[PDB]
Design a protein around this ligand. Structure first.
Ligand SMILES: Cc1cc2nc3c(=O)[nH]c(=O)nc-3n(C[C@H](O)[C@H](O)[C@H](O)COP(=O)(O)O)c2cc1C
Ligand code: SF4
Ligand code: SF4
Ligand code: SF4
Ligand code: SF4
Ligand code: FES
Ligand code: FES
Lengths: 40, 430, 66, 212, 54, 230, 59
């Protein structure tokens, strides 16, 4: 058994990271803040 | 208490060294992940923490600290500020190749261990900082987190819990100092990668003020096996205090330049000749051996014939066992030129907070270039010893220390070699 | 007018008398007859600083640059 | 390395720069990942997004990011001049990174640069008198077990040789994508021998656990 | 001279090469060397007699 | 209650909690040779001149950010303290040019005073000494950034009390130009205060630039005008 | 090594060797040196006035 089970990664273009980020952004906790919009 | 042990198969931490059986959530299910994990997560964090401190885990990535003590420091009762877990997926240290392979093959076990760590210390979210040059395997980790989210397996109520937990990936941008303890933390914060000071601990104030912690990929990856498997079975290998498994990675002038999983202790000559090829040109052909890493001094032949692979033995050999670069170099090459290129690496990768590492790596790079040319007098090489003593312990992080140590090893072992080189250039000029 | 120097008809111009207490200072100024003015010593005020104060969570004290 | 701007139009704002609003949706995803109140953290992902939407970034890209995230611009200039991603100096299409520090030089990395010299023509560190063949050498990119490693845009190449140097250069002159897997056999990060490691497939959930 | 570049000034070649030598030349000729406090007396043979400096 | 004991060179004193070593040393009359600390700014542990040896410690800690734990014994004048100060001063005088005549802080440098009273005298570093291209920060402030020792004091100055954020660090290693990348005039109010913040002769006055020298001039008490504050 | 005229010098094919950094007035034990310094429009630092009291000069 010497068959490379990957090379499913071979197809990766440039924007695939951020596209996966945009597709995988929901069902998520609401990022709890504290008070001010900024440190200024 | 055996003859320092040797690894036997199927007791390994992970399978799929290269290209093997599976890459899927179902592949992790077949290889034994997300198995019995519900009541493991739902037993009580003191049991998991006592298990971690029982197993005697030696921390990796270039620190060598017992991880169970650090996570016991992470057991502060919680205030209004949330707790975070940081996964250091960076590879500097030329010779490493180490958790690149883990994060290519089995990111599911990384998800296992980071959920285990988040449940363990009352943490809430796990950031995973990968090196920015690791884009392909970072996207493979993205596909893995997609699978993990798509199974309904983490997020809200992981495996039927009353527990919420999210994992994120932050890509790097490329610097060795990004993979440090706290310049990491501020590189998450949007500042340029520049560390903080030790008297504020990361367990008090971290990412914007979150009482957080940082761990290596290997320690997180081996952590759920500690939970789902027995006490001190992990400690049944190697020596007493340092005990467990490690990727010993032998690049350089060897046959089959590659990686092995082995136990905590191995004799070096058996490691070279048995489980990864051997020395090119015979055992006597080698000039020297660098174990530990690029933050570790050299070791000559007559020392390393009997020096085995253990933290305490290498510390008694005045070397810090870092990670994964455990390679040799042939008599044919200039170790002067090799160390000079290593110091050029340190010059081209350091931020400039501290004055002494900046100026010390400056002098060391210029003076080692001079010694490549062989220009000076031996009072200069003792002056190189002088600055190499003066740098250490005067910095923020250990990059200046890891710059200071190879010069010390070169002086402590290869003194008449440099004497003869400079004599040759004296005859060359005159 | 001949060179462009600084001339003065002031014999007590360029003295300074270093003392170690204000009490004997005022005592000496009374003792040798001349009038005197007494300014007052202003200490550096002690403060409260920490690197942890520079790295707060919600508080606006944040160096944002280091 | 010329860390002063030296205006020189084709730079010198306003250079024309803008994102697609689909990329603005990406930007809201990126600052949806981070906690509120500390919006200034996403400088590195947003700025890599800008370097990928436009291959080398000008100063107008940095001013655009500063107008988006309402931070002072000097932080953006610090982050851009700091790291090694962001080629502020203009480049061509591709970008060639010959990576070598200690073991790659120990395994004849300089002959690789000799091959790039006598085939590609131009010197190391410099560029070609057209696009798509900007050439530099770099420090450690991890994969030390293989030959001196060649990284092009989001792609590794491992275990090379001068005739395979010629092959990958011919593949770049043909323009088509090569495979990011290593050349000269041993298809992964491998022992080149005969798998001294595991033989039998693991049982998985069947072998030794302890009171789950 | 003495090999003490905080009291005796350095020689001019190593002054115009080195940095520390220039700083020591500069402040040694502006401010002069500091002296620990106290009083001393010494006397040697002048040809007239006990030449004492206090 | 609110009092913590230190043996500063074996001399016991009570210290308020939360404060650090340098405030205790100024409480007992000591100084510590320091560069990047300043008593109006934030604390950023960068200068490394401020080191001091505590007993039972393998390292030597910085005396700016270390909080005062209970019952110290601080050796301000130990052996390796002086050794570390000689080392760090010898590092600081490698990349600093020979401008002691033409500089504007002859008697009023800080490198010169600390290099006498704590530094070495015989030097090393035969070859090197990087050079940095200067900027034009504004027609009120003369700027030669080669004398800059990258002590990171004007940056915190601006980012706190000016809030302008035009001065940043650019680069790594030996090559860290501190300034504005875009050649914009750093001009606001209190910009004249930056030429005294600069502890070396790098950011200096433009109309005063080559007109005097501090030891000739005499100081005189006075009160401000043109403002209701004085 | 005789000590006479108190002359000045200039560079080989160049202007005055003086910089006006006032070290000689700082060390002159009779305080005979008088220096007032202004830079020219070229940017280099120079003088206005440079006086030696050959009366006060103890050589
Ligand atoms: C100069 C420096 C370099 C470091 N390099 C690495 C590295 O390459 N990989 C890593 O995981 N951690 C690195 N670290 C961080 C520490 O090794 C950290 O303790 C580790 O990631 C997690 O701790 P542990 O694994 O020892 O328990 C570095 C730290 C410093 C100061
Ligand atoms: S030792 Fe050097 S690289 Fe490390 S924090 Fe200090 S300045 Fe930065
Ligand atoms: S310009 Fe002056 S104040 Fe600013 S970092 Fe340099 S030496 Fe420090
Ligand atoms: S800043 Fe100080 S050390 Fe530098 S040239 Fe000026 S006086 Fe000399
Ligand atoms: S002012 Fe005096 S010491 Fe200075 S350069 Fe001129 S002549 Fe020489
Ligand atoms: S040095 Fe080329 S990969 Fe590490
Ligand atoms: S004041 Fe402590 S580092 Fe400069």
């Amino acid at each position: 058994n010497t068959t490379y089970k990957n090379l499913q990664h071979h197809d990766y273009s440039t924007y695939t990271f951020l596209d996966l980020n945009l597709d995988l952004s929901k069902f998520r906790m609401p990022q709890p803040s504290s008070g001010r919009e900024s440190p200024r | 208490k055996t003859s320092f042990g040797s690894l036997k198969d199927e007791d390994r931490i992970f399978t799929n060294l290269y290209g093997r059986h599976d890459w899927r959530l179902k592949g992790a299910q077949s290889r034994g992940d997300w198995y019995k994990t519900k009541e493991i997560l739902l037993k009580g964090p003191d049991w998991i923490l006592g298990e971690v401190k029982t197993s005697g885990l030696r921390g990796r990535g270039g620190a060598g600290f017992p991880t169970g003590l650090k996570w016991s420091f992470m057991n502060k009762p919680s205030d209004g500020r949330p707790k975070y877990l940081v996964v250091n997926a960076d590879e500097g240290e030329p010779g490493t190749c180490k958790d690149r392979e883990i994060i290519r093959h089995d990111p599911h076990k990384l998800v296992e261990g980071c959920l285990v760590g988040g449940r363990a210390m009352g943490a809430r979210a796990a950031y995973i900082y990968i090196r920015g040059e690791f884009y392909n395997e970072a996207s493979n980790l993205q596909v893995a987190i997609r699978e993990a989210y798509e199974a309904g397996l983490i997020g809200k109520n992981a495996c039927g819990s009353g527990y919420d937990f999210d994992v994120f990936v932050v890509r790097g941008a490329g610097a060795y100092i990004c993979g440090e303890e706290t310049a990491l933390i501020e590189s998450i914060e949007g500042k340029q990668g520049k560390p903080r000071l030790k008297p504020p601990f990361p367990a008090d104030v971290g990412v914007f003020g979150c009482p957080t912690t940082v761990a290596n990929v290997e320690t997180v990856a081996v952590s759920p096996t500690i939970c789902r498997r027995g006490g001190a079975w992990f400690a049944s290998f190697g020596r007493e205090r340092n005990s467990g498994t490690k990727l010993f990675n032998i690049s350089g002038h060897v046959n089959n330049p590659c990686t092995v999983e082995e136990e905590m202790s191995v004799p070096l000559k058996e490691l070279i000749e048995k489980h990864a090829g051997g020395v090119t040109g015979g055992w006597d052909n080698l000039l020297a051996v660098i174990p530990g890493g690029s933050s570790t001094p050299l070791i000559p032949k007559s020392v390393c014939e009997t020096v085995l692979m253990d933290f305490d033995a290498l510390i008694q050999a005045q070397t810090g066992l870092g990670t994964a670069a455990v390679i040799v170099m042939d008599r044919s090459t200039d170790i002067v030129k090799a160390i000079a290129r290593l110091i050029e690496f340190y010059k081209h990768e350091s931020c400039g907070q501290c004055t002494p590492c900046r100026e010390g790596v400056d002098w060391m790079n210029k003076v080692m270039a001079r010694f490549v040319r062989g220009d000076a007098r031996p009072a200069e090489i003792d002056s190189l010893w002088e600055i190499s003593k003066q740098i250490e312990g005067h910095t923020i992080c250990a990059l200046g220390d890891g710059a200071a140590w190879p010069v010390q090893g070169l002086i402590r072992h290869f003194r008449p070699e440099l004497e003869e080189r400079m004599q040759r250039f004296a005859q060359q000029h005159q | 007018p001949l060179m462009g120097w600084a001339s003065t008809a002031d014999p007590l111009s360029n003295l300074v008398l270093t003392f170690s207490t204000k009490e004997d200072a005022i005592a000496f100024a009374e003792k040798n007859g001349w009038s005197y003015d007494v300014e007052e010593r202003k200490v550096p005020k002690p403060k409260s600083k920490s690197y942890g104060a520079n790295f707060s969570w919600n508080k606006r004290t944040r160096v944002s640059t280091k | 390395a010329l860390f002063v701007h030296r205006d020189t139009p084709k730079n010198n704002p306003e250079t024309p720069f803008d994102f697609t609003p689909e990329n603005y949706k990406r930007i809201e995803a990126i600052v949806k990942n981070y906690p509120e109140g500390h919006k200034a953290a996403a400088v590195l992902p947003v700025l890599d997004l800008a370097q990928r939407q436009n291959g080398w970034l000008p100063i107008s890209a940095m001013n655009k990011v500063a107008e988006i995230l309402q931070v002072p611009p000097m932080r953006v200039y610090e982050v851009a001049t700091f790291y090694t991603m962001y080629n502020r100096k203009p480049v061509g299409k591709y970008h060639i990174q010959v990576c070598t520090t200690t073991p790659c030089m120990l395994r004849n990395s300089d002959s690789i640069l000799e091959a790039i010299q006598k085939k590609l023509g131009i010197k190391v560190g410099e560029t070609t008198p057209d696009k798509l063949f900007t050439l530099i050498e770099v420090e450690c990119l991890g994969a030390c077990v293989n030959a001196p490693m060649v990284q092009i845009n989001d792609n590794y190449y491992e275990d090379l040789t001068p005739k395979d140097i010629e092959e990958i250069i011919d593949e770049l002159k043909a323009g088509k994508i090569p495979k990011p897997g290593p050349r000269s056999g041993r298809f992964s990060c491998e022992p080149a021998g005969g798998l001294t490691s595991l033989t039998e497939p693991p049982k998985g959930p069947g072998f030794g656990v302890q009171a789950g | 001279k003495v090999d003490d570049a905080k009291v005796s000034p350095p020689k001019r070649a190593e002054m115009k090469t080195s940095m520390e030598s220039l700083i020591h030349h500069f402040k040694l000729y502006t401010e002069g060397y500091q002296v620990p406090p106290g009083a001393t007396y010494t006397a040697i043979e002048a040809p007239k007699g006990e030449f004492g400096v206090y | 209650s609110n009092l913590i004991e230190v043996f500063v060179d074996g001399q016991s004193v009570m210290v308020e909690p939360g404060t650090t070593v340098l405030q205790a040393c100024e409480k007992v009359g000591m100084q510590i040779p320091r560069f990047c600390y300043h008593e109006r700014l934030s604390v950023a542990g960068n200068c490394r001149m401020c080191l001091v040896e505590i007993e039972k410690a393998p390292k030597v800690v910085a005396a700016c950010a270390m909080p005062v734990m209970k019952g110290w014994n601080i050796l301000t004048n130990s052996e390796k303290t002086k050794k570390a100060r000689e080392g760090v001063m010898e590092f600081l005088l490698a990349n600093h040019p020979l401008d002691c005549p033409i500089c504007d802080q002859g008697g009023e440098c800080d490198l010169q005073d600390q290099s006498m009273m704590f530094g070495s005298d015989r030097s090393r570093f035969l070859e090197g000494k990087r050079a940095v291209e200067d900027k034009n920060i504004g027609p009120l402030v003369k700027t030669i950034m080669t004398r800059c020792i990258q002590c990171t004091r004007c940056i915190r100055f601006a980012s706190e009390i000016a809030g302008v954020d035009d001065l940043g660090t650019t680069g790594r290693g030996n090559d860290m130009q501190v300034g504005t990348y875009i050649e914009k005039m750093f001009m606001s109010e209190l910009s004249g205060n930056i030429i005294d913040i600069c502890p070396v002769g790098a950011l200096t006055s433009k109309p005063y630039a080559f007109t005097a020298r501090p030891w000739e001039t005499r100081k005189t008490e006075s009160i401000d005008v043109m403002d209701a504050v004085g | 090594r005789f000590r006479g005229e108190h002359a000045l010098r200039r560079y080989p094919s160049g202007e005055e060797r003086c910089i006006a950094c006032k070290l000689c007035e700082a060390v002159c034990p009779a305080q005979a040196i008088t220096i007032e310094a202004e830079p020219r429009a070229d940017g280099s630092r120079r003088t206005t006035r440079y006086d030696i009291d050959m009366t006060k000069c103890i050589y």
